[PDB]
């Protein structure tokens, strides 16, 4: 149908906007702490602690398969990255602190992304 095509075009455009959001958020992680999944070879107890691991590569795979239907889904994954890290690592660690900084800096990007998603529809 023509309606299915129009819905598909909306999703493609949301994907484009979320790709630019993802890039902007990942630049706030210049240490690349959150770039890849926590290695289960290197942290073998991880899944005993963190039930839904997340990282930027995994989000990028979902994004490129158009697997985010709305901004809320995407934000959920971003918050996982932060929240996972702030539980596994203590306050006095470079990892915890990288998360706090990513959260605070990413808030600004996400606030305008929400306005753009609503505005453009």
Curated annotation (Swiss-Prot):
Position of the Glycyl lysine isopeptide (Lys-Gly) (interchain with G-Cter in SUMO2) cross-link: 41
Species, as recorded: Homo sapiens (Human)
Purpose of the protein: Scaffold subunit of various histone acetyltransferase (HAT) complexes, such as the MOZ/MORF and HBO1 complexes, that acts as a regulator of hematopoiesis. Plays a key role in HBO1 complex by directing KAT7/HBO1 specificity towards histone H3 'Lys-14' acetylation (H3K14ac), thereby promoting erythroid differentiation.
Domain Bromo: 9-113
Tissue specificity of this protein: Highly expressed in testis.
Subunit annotation: Component of some HBO1 complex composed of KAT7/HBO1, MEAF6, ING4 and BRD1/BRPF2. Component of the MOZ/MORF complex composed at least of ING5, KAT6A, KAT6B, MEAF6 and one of BRPF1, BRD1/BRPF2 and BRPF3. Interacts (via PHD-type zinc finger domain) with unmodified histone H3. Interacts (via PWWP domain) with dimethylated and trimethylated 'Lys-79' on histone H3.
Domain of life: Eukaryota
Compartments reported by the entry: Nucleus; Chromosome
Residue numbers of the full-length protein present here: 555 to 674 of 1058
Protein's recorded name: Bromodomain-containing protein 1
């Amino acid at each position: 149908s023509m309606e299915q095509v129009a819905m598909e075009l909306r999703l493609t455009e949301l994907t484009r906007l979320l790709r630019s959001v993802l890039d902007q958020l990942q630049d706030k992680d210049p240490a690349r702490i959150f770039a890849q999944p926590v290695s289960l070879k290197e942290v073998p107890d991880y899944l005993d602690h963190i039930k839904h691991p997340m990282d930027f590569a995994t989000m990028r795979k979902r994004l490129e398969a158009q697997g985010y239907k709305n901004l809320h889904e995407f934000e959920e994954d971003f918050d996982l990255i932060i929240d996972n890290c702030m539980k596994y690592n203590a306050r006095d660690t470079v990892f915890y602190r990288a998360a706090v900084r990513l959260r605070d800096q990413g808030g600004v990007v996400l606030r305008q992304a929400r306005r753009e998603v609503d505005s453009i529809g």
